[PDB]
Design a binder for this molecule. Sequence first.
Ligand SMILES: *[C@@H]1O[C@H](CO)[C@@H](O[C@@H]2O[C@H](CO)[C@@H](O[C@@H]3O[C@H](CO)[C@@H](O)[C@H](O[C@H]4O[C@H](CO)[C@@H](O)[C@H](O)[C@@H]4O)[C@@H]3O)[C@H](O)[C@H]2NC(C)=O)[C@H](O)[C@H]1NC(C)=O
Ligand SMILES: *[C@@H]1O[C@H](CO)[C@@H](O[C@@H]2O[C@H](CO)[C@@H](O[C@@H]3O[C@H](CO)[C@@H](O)[C@H](O[C@H]4O[C@H](CO)[C@@H](O)[C@H](O)[C@@H]4O)[C@@H]3O)[C@H](O)[C@H]2NC(C)=O)[C@H](O)[C@H]1NC(C)=O
Ligand SMILES: *[C@@H]1O[C@H](CO)[C@@H](O[C@@H]2O[C@H](CO)[C@@H](O[C@@H]3O[C@H](CO[C@H]4O[C@H](CO)[C@@H](O)[C@H](O)[C@@H]4O)[C@@H](O)[C@H](O)[C@@H]3O)[C@H](O)[C@H]2NC(C)=O)[C@H](O)[C@H]1NC(C)=O
Ligand SMILES: *[C@@H]1O[C@H](CO)[C@@H](O[C@@H]2O[C@H](CO)[C@@H](O[C@@H]3O[C@H](CO)[C@@H](O)[C@H](O)[C@@H]3O)[C@H](O)[C@H]2NC(C)=O)[C@H](O)[C@H]1NC(C)=O
Ligand SMILES: *[C@@H]1O[C@H](CO)[C@@H](O[C@@H]2O[C@H](CO)[C@@H](O[C@@H]3O[C@H](CO)[C@@H](O)[C@H](O)[C@@H]3O)[C@H](O)[C@H]2NC(C)=O)[C@H](O)[C@H]1NC(C)=O
Ligand SMILES: *[C@@H]1O[C@H](CO)[C@@H](O[C@@H]2O[C@H](CO)[C@@H](O[C@@H]3O[C@H](CO)[C@@H](O)[C@H](O)[C@@H]3O)[C@H](O)[C@H]2NC(C)=O)[C@H](O)[C@H]1NC(C)=O
Ligand SMILES: *[C@@H]1O[C@H](CO)[C@@H](O[C@@H]2O[C@H](CO)[C@@H](O[C@@H]3O[C@H](CO)[C@@H](O)[C@H](O)[C@@H]3O)[C@H](O)[C@H]2NC(C)=O)[C@H](O)[C@H]1NC(C)=O
Ligand SMILES: *[C@@H]1O[C@H](CO)[C@@H](O[C@@H]2O[C@H](CO)[C@@H](O)[C@H](O)[C@H]2NC(C)=O)[C@H](O)[C@H]1NC(C)=O
Ligand SMILES: *[C@@H]1O[C@H](CO)[C@@H](O)[C@H](O)[C@H]1NC(C)=O
Ligand SMILES: *[C@@H]1O[C@H](CO)[C@@H](O)[C@H](O)[C@H]1NC(C)=O
Lengths: 185, 418, 97, 48, 49
Amino acid sequence: RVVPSGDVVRFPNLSTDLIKNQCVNFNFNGLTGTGVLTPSSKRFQPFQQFGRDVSDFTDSVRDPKTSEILDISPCAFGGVSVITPGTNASSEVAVLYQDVNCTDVSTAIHADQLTPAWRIYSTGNNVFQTQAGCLIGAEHVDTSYECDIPIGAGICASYHTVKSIVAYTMSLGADSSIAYSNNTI
Amino acid sequence: AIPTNFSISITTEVMPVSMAKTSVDCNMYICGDSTECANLLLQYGSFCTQLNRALSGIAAEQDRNTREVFAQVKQMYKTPTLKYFGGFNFSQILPDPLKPTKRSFIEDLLFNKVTQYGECLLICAQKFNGLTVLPPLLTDDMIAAYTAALVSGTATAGWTFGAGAALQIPFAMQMAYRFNGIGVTQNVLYENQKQIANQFNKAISQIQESLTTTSTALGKLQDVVNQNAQALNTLVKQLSSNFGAISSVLNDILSRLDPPEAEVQIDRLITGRLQSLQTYVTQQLIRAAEIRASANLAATKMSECVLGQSKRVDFCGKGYHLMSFPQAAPHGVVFLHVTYVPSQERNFTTAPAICHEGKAYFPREGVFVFNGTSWFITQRNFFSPQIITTDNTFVSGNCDVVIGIINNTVYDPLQPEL
Amino acid sequence: TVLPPLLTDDMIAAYTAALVSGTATAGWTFGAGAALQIPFAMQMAYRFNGIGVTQNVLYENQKQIANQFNKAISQIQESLTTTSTALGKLQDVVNQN
Amino acid sequence: AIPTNFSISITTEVMPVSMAKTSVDCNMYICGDSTECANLLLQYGSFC
Amino acid sequence: LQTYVTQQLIRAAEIRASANLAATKMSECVLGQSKRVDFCGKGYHLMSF
Ligand SMILES: *[C@@H]1O[C@H](CO)[C@@H](O[C@@H]2O[C@H](CO)[C@@H](O[C@@H]3O[C@H](CO)[C@@H](O)[C@H](O[C@H]4O[C@H](CO)[C@@H](O)[C@H](O)[C@@H]4O)[C@@H]3O)[C@H](O)[C@H]2NC(C)=O)[C@H](O)[C@H]1NC(C)=O
Ligand SMILES: *[C@@H]1O[C@H](CO)[C@@H](O[C@@H]2O[C@H](CO)[C@@H](O[C@@H]3O[C@H](CO)[C@@H](O)[C@H](O[C@H]4O[C@H](CO)[C@@H](O)[C@H](O)[C@@H]4O)[C@@H]3O)[C@H](O)[C@H]2NC(C)=O)[C@H](O)[C@H]1NC(C)=O
Ligand SMILES: *[C@@H]1O[C@H](CO)[C@@H](O[C@@H]2O[C@H](CO)[C@@H](O[C@@H]3O[C@H](CO[C@H]4O[C@H](CO)[C@@H](O)[C@H](O)[C@@H]4O)[C@@H](O)[C@H](O)[C@@H]3O)[C@H](O)[C@H]2NC(C)=O)[C@H](O)[C@H]1NC(C)=O
Ligand SMILES: *[C@@H]1O[C@H](CO)[C@@H](O[C@@H]2O[C@H](CO)[C@@H](O[C@@H]3O[C@H](CO)[C@@H](O)[C@H](O)[C@@H]3O)[C@H](O)[C@H]2NC(C)=O)[C@H](O)[C@H]1NC(C)=O
Ligand SMILES: *[C@@H]1O[C@H](CO)[C@@H](O[C@@H]2O[C@H](CO)[C@@H](O[C@@H]3O[C@H](CO)[C@@H](O)[C@H](O)[C@@H]3O)[C@H](O)[C@H]2NC(C)=O)[C@H](O)[C@H]1NC(C)=O
Ligand SMILES: *[C@@H]1O[C@H](CO)[C@@H](O[C@@H]2O[C@H](CO)[C@@H](O[C@@H]3O[C@H](CO)[C@@H](O)[C@H](O)[C@@H]3O)[C@H](O)[C@H]2NC(C)=O)[C@H](O)[C@H]1NC(C)=O
Ligand SMILES: *[C@@H]1O[C@H](CO)[C@@H](O[C@@H]2O[C@H](CO)[C@@H](O[C@@H]3O[C@H](CO)[C@@H](O)[C@H](O)[C@@H]3O)[C@H](O)[C@H]2NC(C)=O)[C@H](O)[C@H]1NC(C)=O
Ligand SMILES: *[C@@H]1O[C@H](CO)[C@@H](O[C@@H]2O[C@H](CO)[C@@H](O)[C@H](O)[C@H]2NC(C)=O)[C@H](O)[C@H]1NC(C)=O
Ligand SMILES: *[C@@H]1O[C@H](CO)[C@@H](O)[C@H](O)[C@H]1NC(C)=O
Ligand SMILES: *[C@@H]1O[C@H](CO)[C@@H](O)[C@H](O)[C@H]1NC(C)=O
């Protein structure tokens, strides 16, 4: 998850300013929680004050202070999978940050608001964005092979000699071709 | 009763192969930005470990299912240029290189007739309840690539196409063996070639115009998406269950009343959701067992109907099986059972036995009927009267043993040598 | 409570009696398509060269076969007459629920 | 070895098909003519 | 009641696999001469009922 750094408390005419695009611990008027703030475009009415999901979750807000439409989002979360070529092969790993924006993970890692973190860890300048999520610790070659370690969306990970951990698009097989005729057999 | 003529039908079959994989976070489901939720969670074991790996384990076996269906060939055969072989017009079945979408026109129907939770689309987004759908491994064009490769290689070899490395054979000759497989002489194909090709290419368009307008033949697929969305909606509905506590709002109980009061109230609430999450897991788990059992049937049909002629009746659809064809679809496949169906029956009078000079002459194969003038031999699949010689009829034992013997003669080619 | 099924046993017997009656007339296109008509012995003879026996063995030994046919049926009939000892599977499903 | 005579067996097989379908009412099971049973299950969704 | 329904549900799906075998044994075993071994009973199958 991502540590909520920031607090926005507002009331109509104590009050604080408007943080956007940061996981903050907001407190609107009778509206609490954490999340990331951003402006909205939802067509309110003069008596609307805050919207909801079709589930039991408020998703948008109207400012008590300045009467502006903002939609709220949950902060950031997801799971972590660990990639390894085997302790017998090597000793370096790579991680997948499952279903999360690589624009934001790169932001939060330099500010170091990621839980859990580690002692000895760095980026390595190999941030690739998969459809399955954020890959850190592998270089993107453009060749094709069989799928050793699948991650998703046809992308598989492997450990070739270049030796390092590589990510690529799968080889479906050899593109054979054979003729057709009406005499040949 | 013997049929004289026939028809050729293309019977359809839709079988689902794969369930949409899910995952659920604990803390973004049961806690909701509550530190004391996690502080109370530590007295409930590391349940999130097996709750993750159960759904991940069945997520992995979904991709086990798909490659158990498709990943069988070793050579990606290229789409041939000509799409019209011996009067048989396959052009709407292969994907179009002229308008590259890597789908057939038939498949483009299927990606339309089938037409909350976290999901990524290329922008990812996640909702509040810590649950999402992981995307499948094999993307659809990749699946459509295996789809196009097998049907292409189907029309060129067949058996060595199923026995590993394929071969080349003329497509009409491979048709005639399938007639020879069900006991039809190969001339019958050769002497009815335009009529069959008419009956083939009309029946595709008759099928093509059938499923185009209306629907619910595909109902075996959309229910799958309809059932588990209800299962997802079931879990989301359960958030308003108060379980005998104050309310389903943790923050009120955090704000109104004392923590020694609250930590039996939210404790009553946490055990409500945690028990509720187990029920979702178990029904999700047992359902994955059923579709995987259905997938093993589908993978069996892929190798026993497409890569070879079968013989078991009412398998591969009704009628005498001739040739099968796969079609890709979301979470499933569609088979095309090109089958043989005879027609035009008549009445004829039998002859089990033939009395000629006190001996019993029984046919090597076929039976004997009186057409009205004399006696003839034919096969059971098709009315082809032929001449009665020793070439198709052995002798064993004398006459006057069995029931129903006929006084008639046997032609022998020894006679005109005199 | 128990809901009643959609079909009665008599309706199930209606399919059962029809197919058994329809077994003795066509056989293969009986289910593959439209029905046909064949004498029963000729239909029996296809089973022999189906498994690799010439049709004389039927046509010679027809009395012995038919007497092996009907008499073993009555032996099956008296097998499921005295004591059950066989239909425990249908007793199991009633015992389960 | 080549057989000469034969025998025509009649082998049976018995397969189950249909489990007896059931149904059940909640208030005739959990409540039993009570009111506050039905009046307090409102915090439990629609389980029935 | 909840654990009844799930435990009712498993044996529901259990016999449905058994009914599929019956659906196989209704068509393939009766409507035509099968050739596969020890299916349709023991011995060389001729006729089913
Ligand atoms: C093999 O079968 C395929 C069909 O699977 C067949 O290809 C078809 O050819 C016809 C014409 O030869 C195509 O019909 C036209 O398609 C275009 C675009 O799809 C339409 O715009 C056309 O509409 C015009 O013409 C209509 C008829 O007069 C008018 O009513 C209309 O207003 C337009 O002016 C017309 O529908 C058809 O699309 C293709 N189908 C495919 C899938 O490509 C092919 O000819 C067959 N070949 C052999 C060798 O058997
Ligand atoms: C392969 O085995 C079959 C077994 O079915 C066999 O067919 C049998 O052939 C014998 C030849 O003797 C038949 O036996 C006699 O048949 C007459 C016909 O009516 C009966 O009346 C006789 O009954 C007398 O003997 C019985 C036994 O002692 C007494 O109980 C009775 O009161 C009579 O005294 C006698 O059984 C026999 O009937 C057939 N079987 C059938 C079912 O018809 C066949 O011959 C064998 N093949 C070879 C090559 O040996
Ligand atoms: C049952 O089988 C019978 C098999 O013989 C059928 O009889 C045959 O029916 C066909 C109909 O297609 C006739 O075939 C035609 O015959 C004419 C005339 O042939 C005569 O002329 C030539 C030339 O002068 C001469 O050389 C011949 O010897 C004939 O005398 C042909 O010109 C046509 O091309 C065509 O082949 C047969 O002639 C006829 N055979 C006999 C012996 O009658 C019968 O119709 C069948 N019945 C049913 C109900 O199916
Ligand atoms: C609640 O009260 C606050 C003030 O305490 C209001 O904020 C005020 O909003 C107006 C319009 O958004 C601002 O007016 C603008 O001022 C600039 C410079 O003075 C002028 O050039 C513009 O033409 C415009 O009129 C005003 O500055 C701002 N005041 C402060 C202190 O920020 C707020 O609008 C009130 N809430 C509602 C719903 O009205
Ligand atoms: C992660 O979040 C960032 C937002 O911080 C997303 O970046 C946004 O990406 C979209 C396209 O994917 C950009 O939209 C484009 O904008 C230009 C001009 O602004 C317009 O001409 C294009 O037609 C298109 O609409 C957007 O500018 C960009 N915003 C920022 C701040 O970078 C990103 O897509 C998210 N990634 C995932 C995987 O969710
Ligand atoms: C076996 O059955 C097939 C299927 O019915 C028969 O082929 C069809 O025969 C009919 C007449 O017997 C043909 O209809 C005619 O079509 C032409 C052209 O459209 C039209 O001008 C006529 O007025 C009439 O409607 C039909 O075209 C034909 N179909 C094909 C694909 O050839 C066949 O004759 C039967 N053969 C035997 C030996 O029983
Ligand atoms: C089919 O053809 C066979 C042979 O051409 C016919 O069988 C013959 O039936 C006659 C009865 O009229 C038998 O004749 C008898 O022969 C003995 C010999 O001494 C004589 O003493 C009797 O007074 C009587 O004439 C003849 O033996 C018999 N031949 C054979 C080879 O079995 C048969 O009848 C024909 N089928 C039909 C339905 O007519
Ligand atoms: C049999 O003939 C086929 C075509 O008639 C041959 O296939 C071609 O083989 C050559 C090399 O031998 C390749 O360069 C071509 O690309 C092949 N054709 C296609 C369409 O791919 C095949 O090799 C021949 N085999 C033998 C044993 O003679
Ligand atoms: C590791 O792999 C090497 C070959 O690369 C092999 O010889 C060795 O037995 C393996 N050892 C272990 C512990 O897996
Ligand atoms: C065959 O004969 C039956 C009566 O035995 C009759 O009902 C039927 O219509 C006949 N069919 C043909 C095609 O001759």
